[PDB]
Design a protein around this ligand. Sequence first.
Ligand SMILES: *C(=O)[C@@H](CC)[C@@H](CNS(=O)(=O)c1ccc(C)cc1)C(=O)O
Ligand SMILES: [Ca+2]
Length: 240
Amino acid sequence: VVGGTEAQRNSWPSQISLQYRSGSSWAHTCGGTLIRQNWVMTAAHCVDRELTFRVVVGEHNLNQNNGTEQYVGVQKIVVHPYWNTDDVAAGYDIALLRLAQSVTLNSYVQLGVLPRAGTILANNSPCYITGWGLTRTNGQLAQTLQQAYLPTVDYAICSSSSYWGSTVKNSMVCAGGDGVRSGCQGDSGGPLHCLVNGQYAVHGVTSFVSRLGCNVTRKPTVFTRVSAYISWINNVIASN
Ligand SMILES: *C(=O)[C@@H](CC)[C@@H](CNS(=O)(=O)c1ccc(C)cc1)C(=O)O
Ligand SMILES: [Ca+2]
């Protein structure tokens, strides 16, 4: 997250860290959202590589013991059947991870609230992106979980030629584009939390940023629209 602030450790209890085995250690690669005690929602592009993955819930500082983390293996990966590695702009960037163990809930570990199916945010709706991704374009991951305010940019505006043009679809949410604040590599898969009717709900799964850089004016960070996939999500959780 470029232009972010350190989140309080109990602000976003549904955020997880998706990590892959690297030698004798584990490395963070993407965010994700805890949606069942044994299920995490993340981006399909985060699990394109044939790596060993684990999820960390109740994580705050990647490089220090926080005293609140639970570490669980990934037992099953279900990517949207329409996802295509070669066309992120086509959409379907979403995947569900079944955890090997059910995690325990507490103030640092909670299920993300999802929007009702079909919900679309009015332009300029208040949202926060969270994650441990690069703090600058071509930078390094954050140690502590970051958050940045990124107001939505509606479809008509985000799909206009000055913004993302045809690359953005109606199954996606755009947010930000101020040139200061944005998602960045390693934030993918994580949540976009938007305040609706007094409750924060996860409306987006972080998907991509411009090839030009993370914080690029009029290239808001783009997210899979969670409210477009509610039936798919329920179908996968029900069938496995
Ligand atoms: C997500 O982090 C996104 C920026 C918000 C990235 C793509 N996701 S990633 O950095 O996890 C991804 C890229 C490519 C590979 C091979 C592995 C990891 C983006 O650049 O748009
Ligand atoms: Ca930690």
